Design a protein around this nucleic acid. Structure first.
Ligand SMILES: [Mg+2]
Ligand SMILES: [Mg+2]
Ligand SMILES: [Mg+2]
Ligand SMILES: [Mg+2]
Ligand SMILES: [Mg+2]
Ligand SMILES: [Mg+2]
Ligand SMILES: [Mg+2]
Ligand SMILES: [Mg+2]
Ligand SMILES: [Mg+2]
Ligand SMILES: [Mg+2]
Ligand SMILES: [Mg+2]
Ligand SMILES: [Mg+2]
Ligand SMILES: [Mg+2]
Ligand SMILES: [Mg+2]
Lengths: 95, 97, 250, 288, 85, 87, 133
RNA sequence: ACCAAAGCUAGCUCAACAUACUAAAC
């Protein structure tokens, strides 16, 4: 991670995390299961469904991705016909 | 640790000279003056620092970007080397990562 | 003839304006010449010494540019080669002779270049600081309202004796409405004094108000300050800078 | 009331010699000096951590990192080209109208909303205007001539029940910047440009009568209004018999940005003048 | 200290002052203008905008001339505006 | 002491010296004159006819718009062809 | 080759609509309160309580909610002028029957701020509306 | 009691402006 750039002096972001991850506005990160396209003839339908299912990240990985991304990717996006707009918020979280 | 053997002359500082009496007089120029001039315009100093604040790397970057085309050869070389050192130290060295 | 000044701005229904005397700078004895009413949201707000300290520290620091710069080990003249070999010499191992360890070597950290200690407190915070300064100056019997800032003579000793008679204190800050509208009498009387400082209305500040023991305000200056300070209590956030044309703002 | 002002009488003068910040507002910095904060100064023993050479963030000590072992998938693919629409609830619109920020007696537009501070449009962030949602459709009692870029069927029905007019128009990013901040554009010195047409992805949305598109056939509007009324169980009011029918039916030209102004005019705000072009090529280009 | 005039304008200042000012104005104006020579080694693109085949979006493209070296033997002949790449 | 004259922003139009090579380029760009007219106009001294594009500029703008902005009828025809293809 | 132009002042009244106001307009007087958006102005006279909760600059009640550390939920009552201890006593007497115990409160007297431990923003807003603030 | 110790100056540093930029002696 480049904490201080050379041109603008700003903090940069890694593009791998934005290529293979998705941040919901509530702080959660969404990802794909590793190996969901490799050797599908060798795996059971239940395992294939487990691989095709999306998954969340835990607190340490989420904080790592927040450190590796800038503030532009932590904004509120109002997309037209966004499937994850219902998941952008959190409800009934009694902490 | 040898301390001086004679008392120094007591500096007679007058807290009521022109500068100390008129210090910060127009700090509220925009607020109390139908905002036209920001207090940025009262800052006297180098051109790359009038109404701006940053760490050492950002200061060097801004100086090279603004007045770099007028610096001397040795000064520009020292500025480039300082930029390189600060880049490497701030992007590769430290504890908290 | 009694001179009375009423608040030209809407006062809230739950708060009453604060009354103050209007003195004259012409005679020694004529201290009670009129009566003025000052907005409570300007001269009777809550005394916020913390906001006073914030605005004072801001006024002191935001203009600072430290021209202190020492040379690191890379900017010192010599020290380009090893003074002795790494092994065999029996002495300590060193690289450049300009290391911070050496005598004529560079500074390890030191001050680096001109440093600008620049920051802007929020505008409402600065306005509240001005309000608190005015309020404490009024509540500590250190604010005096005069009329037109007129003087009989240009003698600074006249102002000295007048302040000593009225028990104003050692330091006096007289705030006028405009710069070009200042009477030549008071101009020449204040140009030769140190503790008596004459400033226009746009030059009023928390630092000067705390530096001078007594504040002197004219009636137009009071009206101008009230109009300028009460505007921020019911204003929008600037879509573009207020220097640009707005609907109701100049 | 403020007893502190009366307490300040017995206290001495407030000056620069007695000024203290709030307790807790300044956490004191601590330096590596002394017996406790010296002696490796919070860095630890040998290795990379005391010498300041530990690897980067995503590195895990040679193991294939988590941020690189997950397969790439389209999540933000083309995110910088997805049209964004700031939502505006009928609840918030009613709040603005009741508080007086926007006036229902005039045609309400994006410029009026940003002036009333109801919405904030960031066109550099691919924002394409304001969409209408129905979060407060039950208690909406305002009759307004609203002009948005997207609208929901429930919001359109809730506005028609009160007897307003909903219309979905299009604004390319430049026209959106101009419409949101007109004064910074008038202080620029450029003629008012034309309003670009919506792309093929949005043309079927703006040429549809169910969405009240600004390019839709005005002959199909009463039919769609009657369908919405008979679906949501409310009587469609006689809009033509209203005293403010002109304000309710006022429209913008699909090439027009503001109300009353025309593409090609230069607003000189210093002299309060409107310079209009007279050249035939200028007029043809600005009316095309 | 700093120079008042940048180093990039020093040659312009020397051309403006001294005996260089007494030169004919047509020669001076012919020397000042730096017209972009014709592309000999790099092939330019026609339009100023292009649709990205991967992004499917329009982007402004520009032409950057490729540096070509002219050896001192080229000044004695006519190579057609080309040299060593 | 008496305070110095307050710093006041001049409302008069200011034009830099075009012959001085030390003046920046943005202060000589045409947008600078356009903004000076927008700010003052009368006291600026800017020909109000220059705010509009010239003949060649208008021709280039028309070419760009006709090349990168199809007509509504052509776009509707393309959409109809596309939906017919999908059907 | 400058094109000719026409200078007019007729269509300049449209430019007045594009100028945003730098101040906040006062709320219009309605024939029935509360308004459809739930807003309600204060009472014409001031109540005899030894404290006054001044409305916000948008004519709303200064009762907000605050979160700290991700789990600490507080309710902040701001813009209080007068005996803030009386307001604290009234708040505890009002919130005791709802929780069965005295709620935890902090009183910033130099700021004129009450801070209750918990989310009671809507209830405190309704209570201040009934009290006429 | 020797060895010794203490000065406040020579001057430097960072910027602003600036004639417009290889000083004097030749
Ligand atoms: Mg070296
Ligand atoms: Mg070497
Ligand atoms: Mg070495
Ligand atoms: Mg040294
Ligand atoms: Mg520490
Ligand atoms: Mg530290
Ligand atoms: Mg330790
Ligand atoms: Mg030790
Ligand atoms: Mg050990
Ligand atoms: Mg170890
Ligand atoms: Mg060790
Ligand atoms: Mg390995
Ligand atoms: Mg937004
Ligand atoms: Mg908070």
């Amino acid at each position: 991670v480049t904490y201080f750039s050379s041109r603008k002096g700003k903090r940069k972001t890694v593009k791998a995390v934005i290529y293979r991850f998705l941040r919901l506005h509530s702080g959660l990160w969404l990802r794909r299961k590793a190996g969901y396209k490799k050797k599908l003839w060798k795996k059971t339908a239940a395992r294939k469904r487990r691989l095709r299912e999306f998954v969340f990240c835990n607190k340490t990985q989420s904080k790592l991705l927040d450190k590796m991304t800038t503030s532009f990717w932590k904004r509120r996006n109002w997309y037209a016909d966004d499937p994850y707009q219902k998941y952008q918020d959190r409800t009934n979280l009694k902490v | 640790f040898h301390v001086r053997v004679t008392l120094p002359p007591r500096k007679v500082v007058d807290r009521w000279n022109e500068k100390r009496a008129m210090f910060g007089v127009y700090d509220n120029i925009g607020i109390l003056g139908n905002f036209e001039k920001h207090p940025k315009e009262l800052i006297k100093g180098p051109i790359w620092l009038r109404g701006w604040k940053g760490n050492e790397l950002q200061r060097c970057i801004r100086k090279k970007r603004m007045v770099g085309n007028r610096m001397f050869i040795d000064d520009l070389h020292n500025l480039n080397k300082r930029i390189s050192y600060l880049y490497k130290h701030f992007n590769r060295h430290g504890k908290y990562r | 003839p009694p001179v009375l000044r009423k608040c030209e701005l809407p006062v809230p229904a739950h708060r009453r304006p604060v009354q103050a005397w209007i003195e004259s700078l012409r005679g020694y004895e004529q201290e009670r010449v009129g009566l003025t009413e000052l907005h409570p949201d300007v001269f009777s707000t809550a005394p916020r010494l913390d906001i006073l300290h914030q605005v004072a520290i801001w006024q002191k620091n935001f203009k600072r540019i430290s021209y202190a710069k020492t040379k690191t080990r890379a900017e010192v003249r010599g020290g380009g080669r090893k003074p002795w070999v790494q092994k065999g010499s029996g002495r300590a191992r060193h690289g450049s002779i300009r290391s911070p360890i050496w005598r004529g070597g560079g500074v390890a950290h030191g001050p680096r270049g001109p440093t600008s200690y620049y920051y802007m407190l929020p505008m409402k915070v600065r306005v509240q600081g001005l309000k608190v300064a005015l309020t404490v100056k009024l509540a500590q019997d250190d604010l005096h309202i005069v009329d037109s800032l007129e003087l009989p003579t240009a003698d600074p000793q006249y102002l000295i004796e007048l302040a000593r008679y009225r028990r104003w204190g050692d330091s006096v800050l007289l705030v006028d409405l405009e710069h070009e509208d200042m009477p030549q009498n008071v101009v020449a009387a204040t140009s030769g004094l140190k503790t008596f400082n004459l400033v226009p209305a746009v030059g009023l500040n928390v630092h000067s108000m705390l530096k001078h023991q007594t504040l002197v305000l004219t009636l137009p200056t009071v009206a101008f300050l009230e109009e300028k300070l009460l505007w921020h209590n019911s204003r929008y956030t600037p879509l573009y800078p207020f220097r640009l044309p707005y609907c109701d703002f100049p | 009331g403020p007893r502190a002002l009366d307490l300040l009488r017995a206290l001495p003068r407030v000056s620069l010699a007695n000024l203290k910040p709030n307790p807790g507002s300044r956490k004191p910095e601590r330096r590596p000096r002394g017996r406790r904060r010296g002696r490796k100064c919070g860095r630890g023993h040998k290795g990379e951590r005391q010498r300041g050479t530990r690897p980067r963030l995503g590195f895990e000590g040679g193991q294939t990192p988590f941020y690189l072992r997950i397969p790439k998938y389209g999540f933000n693919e083309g995110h910088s080209f997805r049209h964004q629409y700031q939502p505006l609830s009928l609840n918030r619109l009613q709040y603005l109208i009741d508080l007086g920020r926007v006036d229902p007696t005039q045609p309400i537009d994006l410029t009026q909303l940003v002036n009333g501070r109801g919405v904030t449009i960031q066109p550099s962030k691919r924002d394409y205007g304001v969409q209408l949602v129905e979060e407060g459709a039950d208690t909406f009692k305002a009759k307004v001539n609203i002009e948005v870029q997207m609208a929901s069927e429930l919001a359109i029905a809730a506005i028609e029940k009160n007897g307003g007019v909903v219309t979905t128009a299009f604004y390319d990013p430049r026209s959106l910047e101009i419409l949101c901040k007109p004064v910074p554009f008038f202080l620029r010195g450029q003629p008012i440009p034309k309003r670009m047409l919506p792309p093929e992805a949005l043309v079927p949305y703006y040429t549809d009568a169910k969405n009240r598109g600004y390019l839709a056939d005005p002959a199909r509007f009463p039919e769609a209004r009657l369908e919405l009324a008979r679906k949501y169980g409310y009587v469609l009011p006689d809009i033509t018999k209203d005293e403010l029918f002109k304000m309710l039916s006022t429209r913008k030209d699909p090439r027009q940005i503001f109300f009353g102004l025309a593409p090609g005019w230069v607003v000189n705000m210093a002299d309060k003048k409107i310079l209009k072009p007279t050249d035939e090529n200028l007029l043809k280009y600005y009316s095309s | 200290p700093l120079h008042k005039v940048p180093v990039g304008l020093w040659k312009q200042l020397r051309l403006w002052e001294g005996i260089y000012s007494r030169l004919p104005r047509h020669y001076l104006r012919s020397l000042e203008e730096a017209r972009t020579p014709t592309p000999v080694h790099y092939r330019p693109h026609g339009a100023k905008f292009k649709i990205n085949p991967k992004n499917w979006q329009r982007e402004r493209v520009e032409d950057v001339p490729i540096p070509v070296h002219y050896p001192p033997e080229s000044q004695l002949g006519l190579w057609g505006g080309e040299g060593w790449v | 002491y008496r305070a110095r004259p307050p710093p006041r922003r001049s409302q008069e139009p200011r034009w830099p010296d075009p012959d001085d090579p030390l003046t920046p380029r943005w202060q000589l760009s045409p947008r600078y004159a356009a903004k000076q007219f927008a700010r003052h106009g009368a006291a600026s001294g800017v020909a109000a006819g220059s705010l509009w594009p010239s003949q060649e500029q208008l021709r280039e703008l028309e070419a760009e718009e006709r090349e990168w902005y199809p007509s509504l009828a052509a776009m509707q025809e393309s959409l109809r062809v596309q939906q017919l293809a999908e059907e | 080759e400058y094109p000719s132009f026409v200078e007019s002042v007729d269509e300049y009244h449209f430019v007045e609509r594009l100028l945003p106001p730098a101040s906040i307009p006062r709320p219009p007087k309605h024939e029935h309160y509360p308004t459809p958006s739930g807003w309600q102005p204060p009472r014409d006279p001031a109540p005899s309580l030894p404290y006054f909760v001044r409305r916000s600059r948008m004519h709303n009640i200064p009762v907000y909610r605050d979160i700290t550390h991700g789990n600490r939920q507080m309710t902040v009552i701001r813009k209080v002028e007068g005996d803030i201890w009386a307001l604290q006593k009234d708040v505890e007497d009002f919130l005791s029957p709802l929780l069965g115990k005295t709620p935890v409160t902090q009183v910033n007297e130099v700021t004129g701020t009450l801070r209750v431990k918990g989310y009671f923003d809507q209830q405190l807003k309704a209570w201040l509306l009934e009290k006429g603030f």
